[PDB]
Amino acid sequence: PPNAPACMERQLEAARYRSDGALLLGASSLSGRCWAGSLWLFKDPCAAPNEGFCSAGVQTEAGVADLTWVGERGILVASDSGAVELWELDENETLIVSKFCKYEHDDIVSTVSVLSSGTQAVSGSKDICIKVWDLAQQVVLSSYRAHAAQVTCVAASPHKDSVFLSCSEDNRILLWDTRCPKPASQIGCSAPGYLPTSLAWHPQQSEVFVFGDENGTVSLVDTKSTVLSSAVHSQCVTGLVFSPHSVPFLASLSEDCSLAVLDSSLSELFRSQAHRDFVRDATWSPLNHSLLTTVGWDHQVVHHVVPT
Amino acid sequence: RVSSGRDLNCVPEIADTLGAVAKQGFDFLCMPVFHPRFKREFIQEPAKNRPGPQTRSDLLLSGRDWNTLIVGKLSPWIRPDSKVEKIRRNSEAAMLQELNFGAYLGLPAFLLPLNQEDNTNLARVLTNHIHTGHHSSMFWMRVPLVAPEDLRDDIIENAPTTHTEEYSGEEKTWMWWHNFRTLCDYSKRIAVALEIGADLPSNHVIDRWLGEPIKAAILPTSIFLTNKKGFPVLSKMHQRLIFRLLKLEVQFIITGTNHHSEKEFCSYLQYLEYLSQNRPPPNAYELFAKGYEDYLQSPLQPLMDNLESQTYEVFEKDPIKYSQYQQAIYKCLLDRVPEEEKDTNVQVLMVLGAGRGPLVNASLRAAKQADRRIKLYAVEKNPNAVVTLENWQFEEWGSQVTVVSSDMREWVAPEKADIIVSELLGSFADNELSPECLDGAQHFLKDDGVSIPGEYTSFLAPISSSKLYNEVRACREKDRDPEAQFEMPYVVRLHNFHQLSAPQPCFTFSHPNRDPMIDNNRYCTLEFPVEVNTVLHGFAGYFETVLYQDITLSIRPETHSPGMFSWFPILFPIKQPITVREGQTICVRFWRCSNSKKVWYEWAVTAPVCSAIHNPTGRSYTIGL
Ligand SMILES: Cc1cc2cc(C(=O)N(Cc3ccc(C(F)(F)F)cn3)[C@H](C)c3ncccn3)ccc2nc1N
Ligand SMILES: CSC[C@H]1O[C@@H](n2cnc3c(N)ncnc32)[C@H](O)[C@@H]1O
């Protein structure tokens, strides 16, 4: 493909399926002479990560720490350079063009999430800060310094435009609501536990989310509730992704190089050690709801058949 | 000129980044040596066997570039004091890996964070690395003035920020550093990279860092204000802090992205250079004493030793000291001979310890200025300086001056003196044995004779200075008591230190000594109110002397003779640092002791805790009679 690098970098960081079934890929070189990143589109997911068979490709200034679809043609990127980047597919869907690149964070941007309004997004960074973005005007609307350490994860509510979660190495899980004069509320276990590393709102229940910790525990939390947890992984829980089923499953992925699929009670249904390095993302196919695509730092794109 | 570095946590490719950083005007670059997100496993398979290179090659820069332009940075995921054992193990191994790669590259410095209270395991791993081979590179501990928890936005509705003053709590980051360096046993390779915040803390919080080994000051771009033209500037308070860091001559580091994107990024650096050239230019004292900041020297003993020619030359470069002496002799002559008696009365002046003659010349100038007649004896026991004096006498002075090559305590004078003049004073007044010398010369002073100086008084003040404590410590020598270096005073231009209480008088002597029984031994108890939390490392010594009436010399800071740079202060150390809390009183006790051969000082702290008695019987330090 034109305007696409001959080879993507080894460390695969992100994998997101679009509504039509095309696969977005994010990768970064975390060693060697050049430390940069790249963005890829695979309308044929079974051809990934082979560069020749990609639909579109572009390489970025720095590494890709996190990304997310913006609608169906936009790609929002958390960059090592301290920038949040928005890229947009052309009408051809054969190029990936830079919409804006704004250097607002003083350290690595570690996490990004699109709010349900589709026109706003939240980013967390190693500079402790969290920012609310207006994608249209390409400006930061709010900059929040609620945490006391680097921000590990931000996750927007599925259907509340002003609500999102965050979790940091200061051992805080913060529930945000920008409608409140003080928009953050510290939630979670009153007693301090292990640091939280990943967050996922339940796709149906507006009050329910799960979070993983640095010790491998996956915890089911009802905020309006008055806690369910399981020791799923032997190392840090890197991400948690709910299946698109009516009664959804929970894919958990860890630095122990394993993938796990849990039901609603955090009981284990599936387990895959297909990866030989860190498992970085996992995305469910919208077309076949028992396919789960994981990527990792071993440069593998694995298509799991999940017994549903 | 300011020495500046750029802190980055993103370097796609070193040659391009270093070039852009050099163009902007920076002298060095702080960067990661491994990719900040490249978490590595060392125990558990299969992630332990991750192939490929672990970082980029040393061949990308020259040795000289690694040696002088690159400051390394510990990866932000390395947490040796984590609660999770697996994270601890991995962080210990990764810390050693990154530190060893720094040493492999020959980096001049390496940045490690102090971002929480408990860094014991971080300290142990660093200490283990410092004690692996012999290296000299520096470790800059990145510690903020204000802890991250203490400056977060008050935007958590069910966890409001403290609005109640916590005097000790707001000093918490100094304690992080103090505990860390204490575990590492005051390693000379470990220094402070002080990170400045948007809101400065109260003056006492900053003031803890006085006397600490600050090697760098980190200024985030987010703390810069935005002036009329949009150029980045700093607040009045921040400017005061930059100015007072410029006196320690630290290196300044710019971190964060550009937030004045209309302007060029170099402008942040340009403002620092702007501030640096508008500080008060060097005074006469600072111009002469350059290079001597916190440099330890053994006190001269002009009695026991014969001083070298270039030592007398240094004594002589101070016009203020000798014009003061001239003015003192001038006023005494007018007081002693009336206008009517000016041609008949010849005053007999004796310079006791003439050196190369500066006092003799000032006495001659004072005689002409007072328009009175004087007879001069120049007494000097150093036969090498007597060569200088006798060549002066033959060529210039003539028979008005009689050079005497003798000890003033043994010389049989042919007549008595109207005035004896001497410059036998050390940094601590009597520490060259001026009292013993003038006591033995006293008998050939007329019953109404004047001694210049007539009186002198030493002053002590408790000081905090981890740097200075660390340099005394380094003065351990072969073939002697391994703690002897703490039991002797040093002449030193005190620079990087904190004075903990106002100087108080210690020992005083007057001449002539009319007392029937003369005893120069002394015992003094001093109580120093300390209204700050701190660590006591020793005592600064100063002196004041009355040459004549209102003519004085002083190195005591609050009465310092303006422009005179003849004397540096003296430093009395203590073996073990002593913690002092706000409101507590430091009590120190000093003795001046002697026998027929030696004079010495002994000292001890007795509050808030006792120290050992230092230099008992002069076992480590004596002043030869
Ligand atoms: C007449 C006299 C002078 C004395 C001076 C000192 C003293 O302070 N110093 C250090 C010093 C001061 C100033 C400068 C500069 F640069 F400003 F000119 C350089 N050095 C001297 C030179 C010293 N030299 C080597 C080792 C120890 N002390 C101490 C005791 C003295 N006693 C005296 N009777
Ligand atoms: C100008 S420094 C003091 C001078 O006094 C001299 N001096 C010190 N003690 C004596 C003494 N007891 N008799 C004669 N000269 C002395 C020293 O040699 C030095 O040159």
Burial class (CB in 10 A: 0-12, 13-18, 19+), B16: exposed
Q: Report the C-alpha gap between A104 and A138 in whole angstroms.
A: 11
Q: Report the C-alpha gap between B251 and B218 in whole angstroms.
A: 9
How many other β-carbons are positioned within 10 Å of the β-carbon of residue A53? Answer: 13
Q: Report the C-alpha gap between B323 and B579 in whole angstroms.
A: 44
Q: Is A65 on the interface with B (CB under 8 A)?
A: yes
DSSP state of B396: I
Residue B388 phi/psi, 5° resolution? -55, -45
Superfamily of domain B455-625: Hnrnp arginine n-methyltransferase1 (2.70.160.11)
CB contact under 8 A, A31 and B37: no
CB contact under 8 A, A170 and B222: no
Helix (H, G, I), strand (E, B) or coil at B606: strand
Q: How many helices (H) and strands (E) does chain B have?
A: 15, 26
Residue B333 contacts residue B372 (beta carbons within 8 Å): yes
Tokens of B81: 């004091």
- B99 membership: H or E segment, kind and range: helix B85-105
Strands (E), B346-479: 346-352, 373-379, 401-404, 417-421, 445-452, 455-464
Residue A106 contacts residue B257 (beta carbons within 8 Å): yes
Fold adopted by B288-454: Rossmann fold (3.40.50)
Residue A167 contacts residue A173 (beta carbons within 8 Å): yes
Q: Report the C-alpha gap between B548 and B546 in whole angstroms.
A: 6
Helix (H, G, I), strand (E, B) or coil at B39: coil
Percent helix, percent strand, percent coil in chain A, to nearest 5:
0, 50, 50
Tokens of B375: 């007879």
Tokens of A23: 């696969």
Residues 207-246 of A with CB under 8 A from B: 214-215, 234-235
Contacts of B151 in chain A (CB under 8 A): 145
How many other β-carbons are positioned within 10 Å of the β-carbon of residue B52? Answer: 11
Residue A176 phi/psi, 5° resolution? -105, 145
Please name the residues in contact with B165: beta carbons below 8 A apart, sequence gap of 6 or more: none
Ligand 2 neighbourhood includes B356 CB (under 6 angstroms)? no
Residue B428 contacts residue B459 (beta carbons within 8 Å): no
CB contact under 8 A, B56 and A65: no
The one catalytic residue among B171, B195, B432, B487: B432
| Experimental technique | X-ray
- B182 membership: H or E segment, kind and range: helix B172-183
Q: How far is CA A296 from the centre of its chain?
A: 13
Q: Report the C-alpha gap between B247 and B304 in whole angstroms.
A: 37
Q: Which among A199, A165, A205 has a CA at the least distance from the CA of A185?
A: A165
- Give yes or no for a cis peptide into B562 (omega within 30° of 0): no
Q: Which among A171, A122, A130, A212 has a CA at the least distance from the CA of B159?
A: A171
Calculate how far, in angstroms, residue B299's C-alpha sits from the geometric centre of ligand 1.
8
Determine if residue B172 is labeled as part of a ligand binding site: no
Q: Report the C-alpha gap between B336 and B448 in whole angstroms.
A: 10
CB contact under 8 A, A144 and B76: no
Q: How is B410-434 classified by DSSP, letter by letter?
A: T---SS-EEEEE----BTTBGGG-H
Percent helix, percent strand, percent coil in chain B, to nearest 5:
35, 25, 40
**Ligand approaching nearest to the C-alpha of B567:** 1
Q: Report the C-alpha gap between B157 and B548 in whole angstroms.
A: 71
The one catalytic residue among B171, B423, B544, B602: B423
Residue B141 contacts residue B114 (beta carbons within 8 Å): yes
Ligand 2 neighbourhood includes B353 CB (under 6 angstroms)? yes
Helix (H, G, I), strand (E, B) or coil at B34: coil
Helix (H, G, I), strand (E, B) or coil at A226: coil
Please name the residues in contact with B528: beta carbons below 8 A apart, sequence gap of 6 or more: B461, B462, B500, B501, B502, B504, B585, B586, B587, B588
Q: List b or e across B24-51, with b for residues whose CB sees 16 or more CB atoms inside 10 angstroms.
A: bbbbbbbbbbbbbbbbbbeeeeebeebe
Burial class (CB in 10 A: 0-12, 13-18, 19+), A114: buried
Helix (H, G, I), strand (E, B) or coil at B14: helix
Say which amino acid occupies A253.
L
Tokens of B77: 């995921």
Please name the residues in contact with A163: beta carbons below 8 A apart, sequence gap of 6 or more: A156, A157, A175, A176, A177
Q: Report the C-alpha gap between B545 and B567 in whole angstroms.
A: 12
Interface size between A and B, measured as CB pairs under 8 A:
132
Tokens of B406: 């003798």
Helix (H, G, I), strand (E, B) or coil at B449: strand
Alpha carbon separation from B564 to B78, B283, B362, B379, B497 (Å, rounded): 53, 11, 16, 25, 21
CA quadruple B265, B271, B272, B276: dihedral sign? positive
How many other β-carbons are positioned within 10 Å of the β-carbon of residue B237? Answer: 12
Contacts of A105 in chain B (CB under 8 A): 257
Residue B199 contacts residue B144 (beta carbons within 8 Å): no
Instruction: Residue A268: give its domain's CATH number.
Output: 2.130.10.10
- Give yes or no for a cis peptide into B36 (omega within 30° of 0): no
Alpha carbon separation from B466 to B3, B167, B185, B214, B470 (Å, rounded): 23, 22, 11, 10, 6
Burial class (CB in 10 A: 0-12, 13-18, 19+), A162: middle
Q: Report the C-alpha gap between B421 and B360 in whole angstroms.
A: 9
What count of residues does chain A have?
308
Residue B267 contacts residue B231 (beta carbons within 8 Å): yes
Q: How is A94-114 classified by DSSP, letter by letter?
A: S-EEEEEEEE--SS-EEEEEE
Alpha carbon separation from B366 to B361, B362, B424, B623 (Å, rounded): 9, 6, 20, 33
Residue B346 contacts residue B375 (beta carbons within 8 Å): yes
Please report where in the chains the tokens 């600072």 appear, as a residue: B286
Residue B137 contacts residue B109 (beta carbons within 8 Å): yes
CA quadruple B395, B401, B406, B407: dihedral sign? negative
Determine if residue B167 is labeled as part of a ligand binding site: no
Please name the residues in contact with A218: beta carbons below 8 A apart, sequence gap of 6 or more: A210, A211, A212, A229, A230, A232, A233, A237, A240, A250, A252, A262, A266
Helix (H, G, I), strand (E, B) or coil at B362: helix
Q: Report the C-alpha gap between A149 and A132 in whole angstroms.
A: 18
Q: How far is CA B598 from the centre of its chain?
A: 29
Residue B93 contacts residue B47 (beta carbons within 8 Å): no
Fold adopted by B1-287: TIM Barrel (3.20.20)
Tokens of B366: 């004072």
Say which amino acid occupies B355.
G
Q: Report the C-alpha gap between B227 and B274 in whole angstroms.
A: 14
Residue B493 contacts residue B295 (beta carbons within 8 Å): yes
Residue B620 contacts residue B555 (beta carbons within 8 Å): no
B432 is annotated as an active-site residue: yes
**Segments making up each domain of chain B, as ranges:** 1-287, 288-454, 455-625
Please report where in the chains the tokens 């709801």 appear, as a residue: A289
CB contact under 8 A, B115 and A149: yes
Determine if residue B264 is labeled as part of a ligand binding site: no
Strands A139-144 and B225-226: unpaired
Tokens of B416: 């008595």
Tokens of B241: 């802090």
Tokens of B316: 């002589």
Residues 281-300 of A with CB under 8 A from B: 297
Say which amino acid occupies B63.
G
Q: Report the C-alpha gap between A15 and A23 in whole angstroms.
A: 7
| Torsion angle, alpha carbons of A276, A217, A150, A26, to 10 | 40
Contacts of A107 in chain B (CB under 8 A): 9
* Inter-helix orientation angle B172-183/B120-130, to 10°: 40
CA quadruple B46, B47, B48, B54: dihedral sign? positive
Residues 30-59 of B with CB under 8 A from A: 34-39, 41, 44, 46-47, 49-50, 52-57
Ligand 2 neighbourhood includes B302 CB (under 6 angstroms)? yes
Nearest-Cα distance to chain B for A61, in Å, is 7
Residue A193 contacts residue A212 (beta carbons within 8 Å): no
The torsion region of residue A216 among left (phi > 0), alpha (psi -120 to 50) and beta comes to: left
Helix (H, G, I), strand (E, B) or coil at B176: helix
Question: Across the interface, which of B10, B84, B220 has its CB nearest the CB of A215?
Answer: B84
Q: How many helices (H) and strands (E) does chain A have?
A: 0, 27
Q: How is B116-165 classified by DSSP, letter by letter?
A: SS--HHHHHHHHHHHTSS----EEEEEEESS-GGGSS-S-BTTSPPP-S-
The torsion region of residue A133 among left (phi > 0), alpha (psi -120 to 50) and beta comes to: beta
Residues 500-529 of B with CB under 8 A from A: none
Q: How is B234-279 classified by DSSP, letter by letter?
A: --HHHHHHHHHHHHHTPEEEEES--S-TTS-THHHHHHHHHHHHHS
Q: Domain range holding A95?
A: 2-308
Secondary structure of B80-96 in HEC code, one letter for each residue: CCCCCHHHHHHHHHHHH
Q: Report the C-alpha gap between B280 and B117 in whole angstroms.
A: 39
Q: Report the C-alpha gap between A171 and A173 in whole angstroms.
A: 7
B171 is annotated as an active-site residue: no
Q: Report the C-alpha gap between A295 and A27 in whole angstroms.
A: 10
Q: Is A100 on the interface with B (CB under 8 A)?
A: no
Tokens of B192: 């402070």
Q: Which among B313, B396, B300, B316 has a CA at the least distance from the CA of B358?
A: B316
Residue B437 contacts residue B409 (beta carbons within 8 Å): yes
Nearest-Cα distance to chain B for A297, in Å, is 9
Burial class (CB in 10 A: 0-12, 13-18, 19+), B347: buried
Residue A236 contacts residue A244 (beta carbons within 8 Å): no
- Which residue of chain A is at minimal alpha-carbon distance from B36? A30
- B503 membership: H or E segment, kind and range: none
Q: Report the C-alpha gap between B506 and B517 in whole angstroms.
A: 21
Residue A73 contacts residue A95 (beta carbons within 8 Å): no
Q: Which among B191, B193, B168, B268 has a CA at the least distance from the CA of B225?
A: B268
Burial class (CB in 10 A: 0-12, 13-18, 19+), A24: buried
Q: How is B275-338 classified by DSSP, letter by letter?
A: HHHHSPPP-HHHHHSTT-BT--BPPP-TTTSPPPHHHHHHHHT-HHHHHHHHHHHHHHHHHHS-
The total number of structural domains in chain A stands at 1
Q: Report the C-alpha gap between A88 and A226 in whole angstroms.
A: 44
* Three-point CA angle B39, B41, B47, nearest 5°: 105
Q: Which atom of ligand 1 is nearest to the CA of B567?
A: 8
Helix (H, G, I), strand (E, B) or coil at A125: strand
Calculate how far, in angstroms, residue B199's C-alpha sits from the geometric centre of ligand 2.
56
Q: Report the C-alpha gap between A183 and B167 in whole angstroms.
A: 30
- Which residue of chain B is at minimal alpha-carbon distance from A35? B12
CB contact under 8 A, B84 and A214: yes
Residues 250-309 of B with CB under 8 A from A: 255-258, 261
Contacts of A170 in chain B (CB under 8 A): 148-149
Which residues is A134 bridged to in the sheet?
Answer: A120, A139
Q: How far is CA B599 from the centre of its chain?
A: 26
Please name the residues in contact with B309: beta carbons below 8 A apart, sequence gap of 6 or more: B356, B384, B388
Residue A57 contacts residue A1 (beta carbons within 8 Å): yes
The sheet that has A268-272: what strands, in order across it? A237-242, A250-254, A259-262, A268-272
Residue B122 contacts residue B141 (beta carbons within 8 Å): no
Ligand 1 neighbourhood includes B354 CB (under 6 angstroms)? no
Residue A171 contacts residue A188 (beta carbons within 8 Å): no
- Give yes or no for a cis peptide into B46 (omega within 30° of 0): yes
CB contact under 8 A, B54 and A31: yes
> Rg of chain B's alpha carbons, rounded to an integer?
30
